Design a protein around this ligand. Structure first.
Ligand SMILES: CCc1oc2cc(O)ccc2c1C(=O)c1cc(I)c(O)c(I)c1
Ligand SMILES: CCc1oc2cc(O)ccc2c1C(=O)c1cc(I)c(O)c(I)c1
Lengths: 115, 115
């Protein structure tokens, strides 16, 4: 699993379940082409987005549909989405977890990059 | 001052000085148009980006150049930039402070919205 996304909810103290997201890879003309997408599981995790062979060096964007999540909970949110943009680099074997902790007017995102 | 951006450095415990950012506004054809830009001062704040009359309803994106900030301190960070996308002024004019707290592999962003 070269790339996994985990989303938590800071209002309810729980995984953020059924959060949709799309992953994009930056093309040579600086546009964003779709790469993978899915919705978080009951654990707040989205697995299986890509494979080692496909996940080459480049700039990637994860767009997490936080607005729909808060709307489904009846809570007014600030952001249209949470966007995480990063370069994937080959420095030995690397697995990436992109994590996001969500509140209606704030989010915190980190990366856990391991071998 | 309807739109202000404040950036802090979580490694040094200080304002993040000389951080460049660009603000965009979504046009009716759904492209991002340039709206304003600037860099943070010694206080970590960027004031004066827009005016009440120009800052109409719309979807705005603030792209904060966090990568250049960390690279100048010798650090190779995870993110290319921090992106903040939000609908503004949908219920009348408000004042927005966008805040970002930066670490090399993580950032937290919030908004303070006042009437
Ligand atoms: C210390 C855990 C943690 O704290 C945070 C605080 C934040 O503001 C934002 C994100 C996190 C975050 C995670 O990224 C996280 C949580 C779990 I549970 C995991 O299994 C994994 I992998 C990663
Ligand atoms: C970048 C600003 C900021 O972002 C954060 C994110 C967090 O998760 C926790 C705290 C902060 C935080 C601040 O400490 C802060 C905010 C304002 I508005 C200030 O006027 C002053 I002085 C300090």
């Amino acid at each position: 699993c070269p790339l996994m996304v985990k989303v938590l909810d800071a209002v309810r103290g729980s995984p953020a379940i059924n959060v949709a997201m799309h992953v994009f890879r930056k093309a040579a003309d600086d546009t964003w082409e779709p790469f993978a997408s899915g919705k978080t599981s009951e654990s707040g995790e989205l697995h299986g987005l890509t494979t080692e062979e496909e996940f080459v060096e480049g700039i990637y964007k994860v767009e997490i549909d936080t607005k729909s999540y808060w709307k489904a909970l009846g809570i007014s949110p600030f952001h249209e989405h949470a966007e995480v943009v990063f370069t994937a680099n080959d420095s030995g074997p690397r697995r990436y977890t992109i994590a996001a902790l969500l509140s209606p007017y704030s989010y915190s995102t980190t990366a856990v990059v391991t071998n």
